[PDB]
Amino acid sequence: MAVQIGFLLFPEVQQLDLTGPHDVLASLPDVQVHLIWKEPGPVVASSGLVLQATTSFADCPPLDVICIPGGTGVGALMEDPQALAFIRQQAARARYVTSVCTGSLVLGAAGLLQGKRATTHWAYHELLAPLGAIPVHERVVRDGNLLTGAGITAGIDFALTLAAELFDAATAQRVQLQLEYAPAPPFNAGSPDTAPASVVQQARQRAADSLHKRREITLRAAARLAA
Template sequence: MNNSPPLSIGLLLFPSLTQLDLTGPYEVFVRAPNTQVHLIWKNRDLVVSDRGMAIQPTTTFSHCPALDLICVPGGPGQIDLMTDEEALAFIRTQSKQATWVTSVCTGSLVLGAAGLLTGYKATTHWASLDQLALLGAVPVNQRVVRDRNRITGAGVTSGIDFALTVVAELYGSEVAQNIQLQMEYDPAPPFNSGSPRTASEEQLKNAQAQAAPFLEKRRQATLKAAARLQQQGK
């Protein structure tokens, strides 16, 4: 019988996040043994994702226990989060004592804005990967990147790979493989276009053109966050 306290895992839940960035890892983490998974925001009101899904926080910044692992997902709402001092302060405080500091997709840009990726290798969604360097991180074009106690996942669906990697680190590969089997996580996509490496040149150009206005908005937010970090470092 395991009498040790449960591992405390916290996923940040914020307006206009991409829900799969959060729900993919959540599904993995809640299946891990002896864990308590928290969905955290400023209050307990329903939080609406970028595509309209409403999700209920389970705790708040002020009531959240000390976390063993903190995870920041991404999505369009990440832009506002990069200037949200209350949220950034919460992330910094929890990260000081957490064993693992993690993110999925553009959540890594939020970690960077909080000053938590300086000198660390990290990844994010392919369309924003270059922005990590502006925040002092070392961009790595991989599905999951670990550097010391920082583990970051690339875009959206990589959150499942990321969480299985974390579970393997915490509990061993047998536990992670069992969870993968439970979830029947056996990707066999109908198209081979899920990455810039495999999409056609035309598909990639269309995706880049479609996202260009938003990516520029994100870049400007990253530049402002980088300037704040430089100012704080003086």
């Protein structure tokens, strides 16, 4: 009867995609939160922060909510049939199937974005359409029981949205206040629409190799869904 919430924890995850939502959701009554990988034990994030998976795929209970974070490690997952099959297995009955940042590309590779409205990190957004999504430029996009969040820090806004769906608005407001989540960002560069052009150019320049490699992975993943 506790709400079962599971995050996929994988090598080279962008840890804040997971740890933001985790601290939001673990604050709720009558929840149990799982960090899932192929086996329990240490899993190193892209920053070198060490996290700890609490369960294997086999021991994970049926989930009410599955959440796929993003990060450098998603390219491997997009071509990992075990991970994709596990995600499909839990998605079907899960009440909610959510990702954050490039975690939606993993949902896409699993075939779970076909004909659905979805978002991802702004630098990767062109990869949603080949995976069958209708790409929406909004920070949290809901299509039925699919909730996708945009890039990294969007996980906090996504998790508060999810909290209200699982419980109610009052419960989400309580958590928002405990987290003192009234952001006053010291710059206005969080989107390509508002950042200085020089900043956008440098960020695009840095993401370019990753985007090309992910363009190739995405097109192999899509072809597998078609065949």
